[PDB]
Amino acid sequence: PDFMSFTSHIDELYESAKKQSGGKVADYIPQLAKFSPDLWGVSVCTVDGQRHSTGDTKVPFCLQSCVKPLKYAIAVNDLGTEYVHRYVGKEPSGLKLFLNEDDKPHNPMVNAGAIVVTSLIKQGVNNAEKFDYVMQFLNKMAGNEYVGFSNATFQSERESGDRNFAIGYYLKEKKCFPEGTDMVGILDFYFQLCSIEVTCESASVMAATLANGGFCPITGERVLSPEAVRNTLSLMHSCGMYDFSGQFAFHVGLPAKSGVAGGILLVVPNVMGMMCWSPPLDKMGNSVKGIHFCHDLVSLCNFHNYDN
Amino acid sequence: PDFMSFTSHIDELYESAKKQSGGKVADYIPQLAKFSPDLWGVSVCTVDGQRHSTGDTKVPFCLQSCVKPLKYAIAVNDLGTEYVHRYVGKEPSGLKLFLNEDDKPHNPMVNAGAIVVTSLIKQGVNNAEKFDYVMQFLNKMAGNEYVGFSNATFQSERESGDRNFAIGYYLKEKKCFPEGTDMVGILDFYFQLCSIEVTCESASVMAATLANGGFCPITGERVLSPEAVRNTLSLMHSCGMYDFSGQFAFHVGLPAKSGVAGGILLVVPNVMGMMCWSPPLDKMGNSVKGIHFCHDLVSLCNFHNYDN
Amino acid sequence: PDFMSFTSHIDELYESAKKQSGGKVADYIPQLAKFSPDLWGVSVCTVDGQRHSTGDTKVPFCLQSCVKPLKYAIAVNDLGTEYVHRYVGKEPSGLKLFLNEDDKPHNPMVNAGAIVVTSLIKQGVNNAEKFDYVMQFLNKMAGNEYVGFSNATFQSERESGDRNFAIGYYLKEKKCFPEGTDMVGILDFYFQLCSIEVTCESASVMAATLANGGFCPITGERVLSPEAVRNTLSLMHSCGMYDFSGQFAFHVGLPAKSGVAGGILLVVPNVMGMMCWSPPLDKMGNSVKGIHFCHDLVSLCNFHNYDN
Amino acid sequence: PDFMSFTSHIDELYESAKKQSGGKVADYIPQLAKFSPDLWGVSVCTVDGQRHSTGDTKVPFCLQSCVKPLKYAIAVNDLGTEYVHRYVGKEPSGLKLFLNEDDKPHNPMVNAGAIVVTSLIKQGVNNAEKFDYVMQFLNKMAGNEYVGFSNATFQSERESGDRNFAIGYYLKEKKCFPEGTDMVGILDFYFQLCSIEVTCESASVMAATLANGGFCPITGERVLSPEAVRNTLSLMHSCGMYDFSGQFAFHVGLPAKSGVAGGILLVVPNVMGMMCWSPPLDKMGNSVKGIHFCHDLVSLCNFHNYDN
Ligand SMILES: O=C(Cc1ccccc1)Nc1nnc(CCSCCc2nnc(NC(=O)Cc3ccccc3)s2)s1
Ligand SMILES: O=C(Cc1ccccc1)Nc1nnc(CCSCCc2nnc(NC(=O)Cc3ccccc3)s2)s1
């Protein structure tokens, strides 16, 4: 109703979260370890295309697990709910097992689930074509704003990803992939997708596409089917913030997805999309400043799912 | 926008669900076993007080676990989020343990959590006064419509409730109750609350109070604080349908709570409250006709939480 | 071969273990909390009736969980392997669940298993007669040496035993007891059996009866059937030392059973029985001096099950 | 005392077990699937070198998991208890997790534990030299009797062993191997060791070496240290028969190790070693005829660990 006044509040919330200096920058690969703990950016894109940024909103960082709801949305857009969910579950798991009782990954937001979803997209073509296809989808979601790639993060993630190779071999053992899948090639594609780079600005447009029923707000183009968006938002709401998912659902009540680079892709349905980014993570793997910002945003603007 | 046309659709959905003859009427106590499998009623109360009923909507039945979100709402209304959640958790558990890692019941929608919530209400007074206090709250939620009591169900539940006595003694062992709690007396109060009787009509008004931000739509009276309603709706959405909670959240996306008598208390935020009732339950403990009706309602009217 | 020389070694091992001052005396009831941490006794009874004691070997203490293999032996002696094991399992559990996948307690050495075994002995008579019957069996096992009773420990265990009442109600729920069992009465009998008092001297004769194929070495009387003794020794070997059972089996390799009063009932098959007692327990619930003594005994005399 | 009469009983037990036609021959690789379900052999080697065979005792088959206690014995012989158990646990697990709470495989008898033990033997040399070293040890254990190799089983196990590659990558992730370990090379060596072929006759000599305190009974040569043998027998007793380990310990009470080719390596301490072989396996993965034979042997000869 008054965007200028809303941005003053966003700036005040950004300043309050800026003081939260806690957390640890992820350091399992050098490409993550090098990031300054003081980098902090918040970008907003409303469903009507109004924009606002504060802080470090043009510094590229990897999507990491923030890409999981995006590739899940692409798979449902192309294949439908029924086909996708023959391979992956629909609910959160309690706070280590690679598969649920039905030999399926628990949901698309955990590594095993995202690895399986990766195997469903553009089957039958080489990895260069699969990657180009997802890149063109991400460009449409961001209204052609910054979508890049970190080869150094890709190389390091693959070289050091023993846990993801253990998951790949266990999924292969339990026949989790579509028949004729080259599992090692799927792991390559998975590491590549995690290594896609965005800024707070471009990622806020991707979150706004999810908030706007699948239509990119800065172009007006239909990018994702209503079904893909609805499924993605439901799973971001219950499975998107690692083992903090349940507490985030109760106190924040918004669909969101965190990543190890410090990003939090946030959706306020029919209102706006946001990307909050600060490299230091708490014990759950979520950006300390971003979590603080999310709690403050809902308390101030009453954006919670069940707020009257 | 057009209530008369909406009731025609409700009637059509009722007729389609009426054909779903599957399921088994609960038979662990004779008071449940005696119910006809053919009883089926649907009642609606909009946030503006518009009413509609079809089927067996004036036959009393016990709330059973449908009372859990109601007594949780009373506890938060009187004590606040912080105090209540020092004793009970805020998230769903995976598909048997009485307590989570912090020695707290997982959430207010499981037996252990509801037993703990029962111990927080009107502390310091006798059971007759505690029960009268909850009854007056339930009368306000229902706009003074049918709120009764089944002494036979209370007597049978207590006599045969070995699992709930095992939970009571384990909670006592782990110091789960407020100091000075008489655990056996809390179990009596718990069994009494489960044995409160409603009809589809009166229970639909209680669900409409939750849909209307805590204000009873047929009286205009404020019954529950905004915080109590918001917390209750969040926990009904993620924990309300037993081990079907996760699948209900994904496909239906509405706050709901089932009970072993075949009731499903359903909330469509800012639109209406409903009570669906049919004694035969599926393997998850949820009313077969009610589950079928809930899926059909969301597919027809687009009431899902993340529907654009 | 040379008992006089063997007792010199027992005395040396006693002196070395005497220096191990670590551990904490159990303090959940005052009757355990009052024991001096410096009390330390070791008694030996060979299969030929040769006796040796060092330290505090005539100070009475409660058997506590040391009674579990004894009442299990009585149940198998009277009912046979097949009947007893229709109610209780035969193997160790990993390091909290009251029942295994078949709704049976894991084994007779855990509380749930011992509560079920208690329900199988002398069915059909009052508790006074059941207790007198077990007392006469324990007197025969000890060659009529010290077998007493601590009413104060019985009263305190029952008053504070919420976890055991939670187990009793869960076993009742899952139909774990023989039909017509009065569960509360079984819990009374269980608490009474745990409160039976022995000295190191009399308990060493009970352990020697188990080492001598069921024949009391100081009387020559057959007390337990060969089958009862064989089953009891197998379960003491794999399930007798709480969560230390697996490490005790590997490094010590002898059938043994610990209790919260600091007792360790030890059997060296066809050689001797022993009772080691020192109230301070380690984090696993086992007597610190007794564990140290057991490891030293096997390293010195080569008593391990698989020692050549 | 009378070997001629004992062999008459062995023949009678062989004939009774021959009638047990149940079970399913393992068919996950063609090299196992091709074996006749009617092949059944029993070989005995006493600690004094007396021999007896009945049935198909010269038909080669793969050791498979029967090799696990043998390579564990080699590792303890060369490195000692302390060093080996810094990498692997000492106890049975309940009836799927790759590691225990300390990030160690549960014991040397499960795949993860055997893979870790494989990484400890002859570190620093190529796989050809590691394999030759283990082969020379196995030749000494068997008194230079049949020790062969199945290249077809090795090739198939490696090609189809996705679960073992998932375990290898998870162990690498959790730093389970000695520093500088080439995990893929360890998996090659592991598959090779499982593919070593024996007959009932030669394997009975290996079991007799374990029964004779590490001395080969047909040569008199010391092959394994007393410590290696004692540790191996303890772990075969509690962890050797898959999820049947606990029931085998209680009813049979002998150290034994089964394999998917239908072999059961059995040790009767200070008496004899045996190899029972019949390809059809029960639901636990144990040879049906061999399990039946083991139960009958203990009931007839009173060979149980705790038999008086
Ligand atoms: O995590 C600890 C230590 C610890 C730490 C803390 C506490 C205890 C223990 N150890 C670990 N070791 N490996 C780990 C990761 C891979 S789990 C092995 C492969 C599987 N992946 N999915 C599976 N799903 C099912 O097996 C389905 C199912 C579910 C339920 C019922 C039946 C069937 S099995 S975690
Ligand atoms: O359910 C089966 C058989 C089965 C069936 C199917 C499959 C397997 C087994 N057997 C059962 N036996 N009793 C049962 C119910 C009462 S559970 C005992 C009392 C407790 N209540 N809450 C607790 N919470 C924690 O202990 C917290 C914690 C969580 C995680 C880590 C540390 C600490 S312990 S279910």
XYZ file of C-alpha atoms and ligand atoms in Angstrom, chain A residues 96-104 106 163 166-167 170 174, chain B residues 101, chain C residues 101, chain D residues 96-104 106 163 166-167 170 174, ligand 1:
67
model
C 20.618 -39.067 9.195
C 18.893 -41.968 7.291
C 19.316 -41.714 3.507
C 15.817 -43.159 2.774
C 12.361 -43.414 4.378
C 10.497 -46.767 4.983
C 9.365 -46.872 1.318
C 13.009 -46.611 -0.009
C 12.411 -43.032 -1.101
C 12.184 -38.085 2.660
C 28.737 -38.093 1.776
C 27.660 -42.476 -0.360
C 24.065 -41.262 -0.932
C 22.818 -46.143 -1.723
C 17.728 -49.316 -3.708
C 15.402 -35.343 23.060
C 9.427 -55.534 17.670
C 21.029 -50.758 8.957
C 23.217 -47.828 10.238
C 26.727 -47.837 8.742
C 28.370 -46.508 11.967
C 27.816 -46.503 15.746
C 27.624 -43.279 17.902
C 31.451 -43.005 17.948
C 31.685 -43.025 14.068
C 33.062 -46.555 14.115
C 29.749 -51.722 15.107
C 25.837 -50.925 -0.981
C 27.995 -46.474 -0.297
C 29.629 -47.810 2.907
C 30.527 -42.952 4.168
C 33.748 -39.895 8.662
O 24.060 -41.923 12.861
C 24.848 -42.812 13.175
C 25.372 -42.958 14.589
C 24.379 -42.489 15.627
C 24.361 -41.168 16.046
C 23.447 -40.738 16.991
C 22.545 -41.623 17.537
C 22.552 -42.938 17.130
C 23.463 -43.369 16.181
N 25.327 -43.727 12.280
C 25.091 -43.661 10.925
N 25.643 -44.511 10.110
N 25.298 -44.256 8.789
C 24.531 -43.228 8.654
C 23.983 -42.680 7.392
C 23.478 -43.724 6.427
S 22.128 -44.709 7.127
C 22.502 -46.320 6.398
C 21.896 -46.479 5.026
C 20.455 -46.138 5.028
N 19.980 -45.070 4.485
N 18.600 -44.965 4.595
C 18.090 -45.971 5.242
N 16.730 -46.064 5.443
C 16.133 -47.113 6.081
O 16.773 -47.991 6.653
C 14.620 -47.142 5.995
C 13.954 -47.648 7.255
C 13.622 -46.777 8.281
C 13.009 -47.240 9.432
C 12.723 -48.579 9.575
C 13.050 -49.456 8.565
C 13.655 -48.994 7.410
S 19.243 -47.155 5.768
S 24.105 -42.459 10.162
